[PDB]
Symmetry: C3
Subunit: 225 residues, 3 copies
Amino acid sequence: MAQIWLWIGVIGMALGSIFFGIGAHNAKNERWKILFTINFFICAIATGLYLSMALGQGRSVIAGRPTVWVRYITWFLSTPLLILDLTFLGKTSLPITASLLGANAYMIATGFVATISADRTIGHIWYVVSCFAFLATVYLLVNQYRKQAERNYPQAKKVFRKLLSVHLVLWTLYPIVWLLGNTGFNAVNQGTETMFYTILDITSKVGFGFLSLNSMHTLEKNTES
Amino acid sequence: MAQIWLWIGVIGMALGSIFFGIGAHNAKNERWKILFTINFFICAIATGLYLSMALGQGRSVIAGRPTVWVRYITWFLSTPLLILDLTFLGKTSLPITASLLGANAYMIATGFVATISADRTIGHIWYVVSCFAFLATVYLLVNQYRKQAERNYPQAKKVFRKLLSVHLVLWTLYPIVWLLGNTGFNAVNQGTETMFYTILDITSKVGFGFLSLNSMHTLEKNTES
Amino acid sequence: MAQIWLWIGVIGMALGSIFFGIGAHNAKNERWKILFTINFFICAIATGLYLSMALGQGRSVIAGRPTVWVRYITWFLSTPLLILDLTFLGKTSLPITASLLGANAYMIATGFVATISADRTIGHIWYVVSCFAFLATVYLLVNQYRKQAERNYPQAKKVFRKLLSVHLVLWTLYPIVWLLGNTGFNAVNQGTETMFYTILDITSKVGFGFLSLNSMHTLEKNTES
Ligand SMILES: CCCCCCCC/C=C/CCCCCCCC(=O)O
Ligand SMILES: CCCCCCCC/C=C/CCCCCCCC(=O)O
Ligand SMILES: CCCCCCCC/C=C/CCCCCCCC(=O)O
């Protein structure tokens, strides 16, 4: 079960990479070329890292607990680019953009330590810290990020509402899967945990990538002379 | 002894993080929001890494020698932000800013290898190399950095004198502690070495952070219309 | 044989570092100071990493196969700066510059996994992936990169022709050495493989660095008023 869902992730990310790369090659406009290129690399990074996991790499048995630590490499590299999708679209200021990237990096870093710690009490402490880092990004996204975006695009508040709603709902699912998996309560087996993360990853990457392109199109139409 | 001083570092860095974060949230002005945000992340990174050390993590017994290798992660991430405090305040040029960040990264990288090498002869070679990297940053700071700062703020030469004096004196203490600790002569025990680095870290981070804010205030008063 | 060629690399890189550093210290002009500084750090990074290899570090016996994994650290840090030599000279756009840096990072990252994988079938898969990442950079260099450079310097198409010819020919030699060495067919012994990489590294770093300076001089003469 786990093995097929890793290959489904390879396929899904590779397809996202091809279609974003084609969009990048045929962009009209530097802004469009940038946005296609960000999403190309989100999906291209995830393709290679899903390929390593599918081939059996990036995994260690830590005190009896199978642990796919390479998952946190993918997340550390791709989540900042998703943040950049948002801040590129919202024309976010430099301090708020840096704060989002830093709090996000803090979340993935502490989530990684939460995962590879042999002492699961210590790991669960790091889980809580990582949740507070996520909550920091929630605060920044629904306050300073949102208000700048709505000031920059007064006619497209609904666009950023949908982007933020999809981002917040999807990203909140990751710490739930983490608690269900063998990092937490072990309420679901490894095949199910892997299926969950594969579906989340394809949705938060390919799915969010296509939503970012559709948002760009709406913003540019609302901004034509 | 070592254990309490790691917790003192957690407390000190967390307090610095809270007060710099509060300053960031209430900044008037993008320049002030940037400077508060740099110092927030300096202290927030150090808080998490001090928490890992306090919990017993980030440590390895290398050929019989207890070695807190995670100390070099904290330093690799936080020292460039301290460099940025300086170059942000001095409005340093891009080549000099990159040279300071690169020489600094070289220093921490070679200091890390100097520390984890089992062969302490090789480690001591890397210590010397790291000292020359530090000396490179000294040269850049008291020449090109200082002269640009004084050209940018002709009325505030004393401000950069104090910043540079505190930076140079404090940062020179780290290679002295390193020679005293079990990386070198082992003239002081691990509790004392840990106390020294905790006091240095709180001073060079929280202390220097507050000095950078006070300097900003002096520069802005000297620069009001 | 391997040992002397590692020391030859130390010497060659150190000499390149000194002469690029002297150029940086005596630059007239921010553009010249930037270009000297990029090449200084290319060679300074390679000096330190060649010193680690010469001292016997950065090497692991992976399932019976001696593997100098630190070679990929040098490459991950220095190859983006060589890309920057090119994009600095060509005044390349942000999306094309990011795509070159990302595809290049992808190449070195997958080349590293291709090297440290114990399963050499999996390693050879990663070799192919890394070759396609290289081919991606070839496509970007001879299409978008070249066309922007020739649009920016209509009178100096030959300058970018020589830069690209040297870059493409030299960099193609690395995957050939990799196939000849103990990562592939093991057709040459470790001393010969090390000699090959040392000569390639000195040429692609010091040699290309001096070519980038000579190109800058030609571009500036073709651009004087
Ligand atoms: C792989 C992605 C990692 C992202 C790390 C993000 C780190 C964020 C740190 C924030 C502090 C810097 C705030 C802005 C500094 C601006 C400096 C300047 O303007 O000179
Ligand atoms: C975590 C922090 C690490 C800091 C690393 C710093 C590396 C410094 C390297 C210097 C070489 C680059 C010099 C300036 C390049 C400008 C490029 C351009 O203008 O296109
Ligand atoms: C050590 C060097 C590593 C280099 C990594 C390069 C990663 C390349 C990734 C490309 C995606 C980003 C494309 C441009 C984003 C611009 C963002 C913006 O303008 O706000």
